[PDB]
Amino acid sequence: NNPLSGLTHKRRLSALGPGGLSRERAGLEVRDVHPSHYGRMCPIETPEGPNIGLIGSLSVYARVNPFGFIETPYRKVVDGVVSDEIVYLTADEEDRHVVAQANSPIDADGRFVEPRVLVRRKAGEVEYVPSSEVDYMDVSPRQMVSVATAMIPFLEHDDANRALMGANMQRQAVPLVRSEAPLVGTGMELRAAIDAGDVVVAEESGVIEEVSADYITVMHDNGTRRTYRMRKFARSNHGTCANQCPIVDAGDRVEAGQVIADGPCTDDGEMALGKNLLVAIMPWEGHNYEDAIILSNRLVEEDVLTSIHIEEHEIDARDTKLGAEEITRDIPNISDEVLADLDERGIVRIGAEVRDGDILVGKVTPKGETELTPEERLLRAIFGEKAREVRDTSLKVPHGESGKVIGIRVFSREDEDELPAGVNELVRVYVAQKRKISDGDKLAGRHGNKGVIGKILPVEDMPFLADGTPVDIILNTHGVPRRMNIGQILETHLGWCAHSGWKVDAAKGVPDWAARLPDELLEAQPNAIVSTPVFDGAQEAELQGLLSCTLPNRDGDVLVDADGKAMLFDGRSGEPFPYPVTVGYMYIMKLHHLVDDKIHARSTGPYSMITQQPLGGKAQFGGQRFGEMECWAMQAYGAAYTLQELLTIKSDDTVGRVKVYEAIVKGENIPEPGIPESFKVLLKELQSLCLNVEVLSS
């Protein structure tokens, strides 16, 4: 779905498969977090479902010993002074040492300011120790964290399970058409995008000779020149676009390792899985009730949240006992307008838009003839219908999607192409849909605050600041304090500060809060980008001081006051909202749970063979599962006839099914249900086990 998902599928530690315990075998002690995990395997990033705890991710600094044991780096302290020497330590020797803390008050010389420091002892315990006794120290913060989780701002302000949810949803965000870099982030996005391999990098330093939309040629120093071909609109394994775009000029020089062309979910070479949205955190008219989300219509209009979804369809012409199926535009008993998009080859033209029920490949099979019913003979007699000896098992687009056609690949044996034995022609057809954002789609922050889209609202009917800028997205305020993810609000405040810019007035020195704040951060231009490393982050006092000085936008106006709130105008009644509500910029991503891929309905479709139950799943035509719990609920209501109908004439009684369809089409009342076929199957099954089971009528 994105370079994050790829990089997290790699560098992942499973606990299933041959030679290991299985989900049927997992123990709670196995699923627990062992204290030896620190710096080896992340305790936050893990799947949420039944396999919770059996799959994790390598810590960002982890390494594998030659014998398959996970080891992590750590600095050493001698004489109570931390050296620059780094040694890699396995969990075996860690118990024989006393490892100090990453964010300890170092004195720029090697010594800690307090004699007693908080450390981990042999048995996984945490305690205070005189400084002159420790022997190891953490290389950095975020040593204990994975690669995905390390991209969550204000992680330390988030609860463990909500941070787990956020890290698990970081890897399901679809790639949009723009992928704007987040206003607030961590420094991990650059390295993640570089190491995910989805961004072209200059392998040799040199000037750039010429650039187009598909290739980039670089003139190296030593006479030779190199060409990087750039993949465009290639479908990934999960049906998302993998477009790549150049970010370089025609004359600029590049160094080895520099980004040349950004990928699907990247901006200027750093990972960008969503968009910055102006957010208010007040409840609105009940449309954001119970984790629902509201958005302005300008997100639909400006294509802020839109995605390209490419789908491939396959059909093969294969030899058979009666001859060979042929892919040809000549297909019996078909109209002409539906054949307009078909070329002479028999395959839809590239660029011809298609919709549900249309033919992509006209593939016709040799059937000969079957039992010709009297009516077919009468019809060919009355009108003049011909032999039409062949059958049409043509490729039709599956029910429920449309869109344009990108390209076609055609394989045949006459062109030397290797094919499976028995198949002489293979055809794959690629179809794209530019899916816009709609209600039912799932949005999420980086802090586990997910929700579906309750309603898309017209841009006029949205709360707008005094400047007149409407808010873009509205989230409910009851979801924050119950789930303990205040870090998202911290991110909101810092995002507003980074969007507006700031200047700390150093008229008489720097203020007290900015004494330890780094230089070059006292003054930031509008629309700046800031990085908050997960545990050496931005303190609350620093954020408050930044919010204090938040230089005005266009004219002299501080829309957001000292405490981060602002005054909004109700776009429906016009009267100002009685109390200020917090507004800011939050990074919102669209997850791969689009309603278009989750909507199903069935009236009558296929049935299974052994028992006449309907099929299941969107691949077949489906049919919902009425389980034992639903049967219990139906009996609890005392409702019997609907239970009879849900079990008999909708799932097993074949004569009942046909008769009920005839009755409903003709307009008469539903007939009496019969005997389910599954019960007869059970009866014969028990009979085949040498059991004399029968039914007695009196």
Partner: peptide, 21 residues
Amino acid sequence: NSVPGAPNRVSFAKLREPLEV
């Protein structure tokens, strides 16, 4: 930054790590 084409990203980090990722 140690990456030639890195966009500037001001940071709130107080401490300097010894070794890179």
